[model samples]
Target: TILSDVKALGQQIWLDNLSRSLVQSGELAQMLKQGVSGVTSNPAIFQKAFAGDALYADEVAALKRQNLSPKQRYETMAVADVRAACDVCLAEHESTGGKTGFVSLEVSPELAKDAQGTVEEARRLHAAIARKNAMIKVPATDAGIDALETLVSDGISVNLTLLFSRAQTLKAYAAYARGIAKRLAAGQSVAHIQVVASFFISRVDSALDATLPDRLKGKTAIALAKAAYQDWEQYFTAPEFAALEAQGANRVQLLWASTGVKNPAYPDTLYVDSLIGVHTVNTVPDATLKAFIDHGTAKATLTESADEARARLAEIAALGIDVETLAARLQEDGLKQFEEAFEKLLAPLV
Candidate 1:
């Protein structure tokens, strides 16, 4: 029934967490058969895998004895896990002609602001794994945009990560456009170059909603998503994108990331059912995905109120909350969170 609801919306529902167990246990492959199109990994997700499961214990102990630094040991397990997941999802990748089936692996969060460093790490990770469906996940910081532009120009698939605001999403789109334009000018094939602007959904509401009274308790992120979808409509339909469209370049799809609502006061599936639309992706945690299957409705509701999304955003701005500044800070804070997770992952080995 969940897969049927997903199919009705014409959008791909991907799992945002991946590990050796998920792939080896055949759960990921089964999900693929059930309409799950992609997998995404982050430091937090990997931390859970390393801490909560026995799957990686042997590998961790081996690396610890070999005297490999914790960071290096962590990379060994993470990369292997990601590569395995990529293999598991390869069929979906081929079936979709490379659209929905992707596995995202991010660079070290510490390098989020380092444009050249992020690009180098991306290239290394991309070639090291050498999987067609493997996406190099890069945070959408100011420097990340610079790095992403280059990666896309080089005909690499990138999953733009940690986006928190509408402005950030537009900047991500611009980066994607510039990259495709550069590739077109160079006479390179643009058919396979894909980009997803991953907007973080739950955190926006979790951070801002408390300041407002009862009525607006948990609406910021979805409201922002609705607004962002309106901008996406205009961007794709613009004259600027027509030439790229002619060249077989795909529109950068809006990917809803961080859909796992942390606040227990809200409905668990609040983020999933609220943001369905065509040409978009919603990456949810396992529990939330199941909750959606049990009681979620699918509809083309994202673009229903073009004016209101914008007005709500402006209203948020009028309350002295600069969403753009918040996005930048969030990216910085998100990077730190990942780095801390990586550090904690290392301590057990240390």
Candidate 2:
């Protein structure tokens, strides 16, 4: 009831973890029937999979015989797994006409500051996967953000990852609109491109809780997403985007990520249950998804909490824990976190 109920209300639940066994075991296919329509993968998730999953052992052995750099070996294996995931989501992707079901594979964090490198790598990854449902995950750094417009303009679906603030999310939304408008201007197909602005949820709470009063302790991430949703609503409905919308353009969906609760003191479903709304997606870790399926209630909690979400941010600001500055720090730290994982993932290949 929990999974389908969330879907019935118009929000989609996407599993944020993926691996060979999960895809090949028919488990991902089972989840798809239960309402999980997509998958998300990043360096940390892939690192865990390669280290622990036996299904990856054969691939590792096979790739070792090939003459390739450590990075190429990693991509060679990751690309195959990503293709399997895309195939699993194909039915939903087709049914929705490329609007929903997708699996996100990230570009190297090393390329976060390099615009052309990011674009080049993203295109290569997309082509290698050879699935329309495969979305290349890009960081939200300034250069990464600019690359998003170019990729979208080229008709590539993207998951703009590591976003931690309103400004960051708004900037991504603008770039997407520009991308779509550009495609329309060139008389190219805009209907095929799908993009999502992924906003990290629990990391915001993890960053501010130590200095916050108990009442504000676990509120930062949820408030941040709700506030950003307001920005999404305002931006897409205004006169500026009307022309694109008329020409069959898509509004970039907001995806809730980093959704696993980092603090044990908070309810496990705090991020999942509280952030449910239409036209949004929550890419949950396995533990949180299990926790929600067992006892979580599904409802439109997102819109109802807007006023409180806004007030909470103002309160956090009054305490000198400026959310904006913290958002910047979290993104910086998030990139570092992913980069280290990426390095660790490649070490064994070397």
Candidate 3:
């Protein structure tokens, strides 16, 4: 019920999964009508969707018979799905003039560490799709961040995905700010260049819960998210960004991802209920969305416990557990997962 109410709090809910049926069957269109302003996808999500649906089978069969490499065949199908998804979200794109209503398609994780390669692929993918509403998702690796500035400088919308800590998220913000500055210097329009730093939530707790003492098990992830939100506010509102903001450059909003509750002992809506704020997004899975709609409260909670959140983070650090380092490891593992999925997504083609 309150899912729609989130928009009133200045936040948008983007679905983290996409499939052929969801787009072709008009469900994604309906979702956009109901305040869901964006859609996001990755190699893992596509791997499952391509495996689960007969809708993808006909195309897969045809592609297998063609003289194409496994990667090309995979891209051939994914490109179509993302292109269709981008079309479905175009209305929102129009309504906001590129501010919202976008879909994200990731660069191949195989190029996760290749800065120039990532940019070339990102450029080609964006051109291939040829939709203003389609955002190219990039990992938060050093190379990904390097590629990011180039992507934004070229006026391409990007999502900095797989972030796990405040430090990593901050780097993405800096890159976008620089990208905006560069584009502006070249007399380009930064207004239509959209970006989101997708900081993951549940995975943090999943990684630390067992070692955490009481009062800490489920507290750290939300705390880190809150701290990052404060960073989001300060970065975009600061004197430097004020100069760019005045020139029509939009702030790269922090998007909360991997939001589903991994701990059964926790409330299903914990991440959503806690991180509601202005100019942010929460990309949730289907199960979490259902739970939020059925029993969620909509209000401004992100700024509520700022002092506590900061203190909690400090205490966690005192335990000698450096969140920044943990985030780096998590990012590596995330790329591995995507690589494995990509391999599976192509294996059947061979």
Candidate 4:
């Protein structure tokens, strides 16, 4: 009922996890029935999933026999898992007319700054998975924007991750538009190309909470999200996007990532309850999803308090907290975190 309540508000709930056990045990199918529309994964998630489980032992042993490098072995497992998850969500994909039901598989973190490599790897992974519901995730770095444009133009669905600032979000949107425009020029259909700009939530507050005045504690991230939603409305409603929409281009919705509450002091569903709105997706962890299902309140809160959000952001700026600069620094930190997780994920295989 909670899931249906949130969906009625126009927001899709996606699980921030995928694993062999989830699919084989039918839990993933049950979740789909409960209204989880998608799944998102990264190196960190895969590392946690495969580190201690025999769920993948048979495949790992077989892959070991193939004499592949550690990275290759990891990809072999990841791609298969993604393909399986895609199959589980295939029904939702059909029922929603392809507007929902996607499984996101991230490219190697090492390719975050290599546009060509990112594009190549993304294409390879997409082909390996070979599922229409699969989404190749690329970081929203400068190189990522270039790769996103190329991938989308080539008619591939992309989930642009690691976005934290309005500037990065705008660049991602522009790249998506450019990709669709090129696709149209090449006489390709844009109707099947799906993309989402993933804006992280709790990390913003986690990074800035210690430096903020007491009054601003626990509020920065939600404020930023509200403002970003406003921008999403303006950008999508503009004539540039309207023109593309006329040509059957799908709207590149905003995805709220990092929705789990890190600080124990905050409400468990702080991020989930406050971000319910139309044309958006929230990829929540299992704990957060359970918390929401238990007692979460859903309403149209994403577009509320626009002026207040702007004023709060302005206040932060007035206090010498350069949000743009901070966003860049956080992105760098995130890349390193992913790279470390990736190395750890492969180390066990080696």
Per-prediction tally of clashes: 0, 0, 0, 0
In model 2, what are the clashing residue pairs, if there are any? none
Task: Pick out the ten consecutive residues of candidate 2 with the lowest summed lDDT.
Answer: 53-62
How displaced is residue 276 in candidate 2, in Å?
A: 0.5
lDDT of 1: 0.86
Give the TM-scores of the predictions, in the order they appear.
0.95, 0.98, 0.98, 0.99
Once fitted onto the true fold, the runs of candidate 1 whose alpha carbons sit more than 4 angstroms away are: 65-67
Q: Candidate 2's C-alpha lDDT? A: 0.90
For candidate 4, the TM-score is 0.99
Better of 1 and 2 by lDDT: 2
Return the TM-score for candidate 1, rounded to 2 decimals. Answer: 0.95
Which residue pairs clash within candidate 4? Answer: none
Candidate with maximal lDDT: 4
All candidates: CA RMSD (Å): 1.7, 0.9, 1.0, 0.8
Q: Among these predicted structures, which one has the highest TM-score?
A: 4
Supply candidate 1's per-residue lDDT for 290.
Answer: 81
Best-to-worst TM-score order: 4, 2, 3, 1
Q: For residues 164-248, could you state the per-residue lDDT of candidate 4 as single tens digits?
A: 8998999899999999999899999888889988999999999999999999999999999999888889998999999999999
lDDT tens readout by residue for model 1, 181-292: 9999999999988888899988888778878667666877888888888889999889999889998999999999899889999888888878888889999999988888
Per-residue lDDT value at 60 in model 1: 76
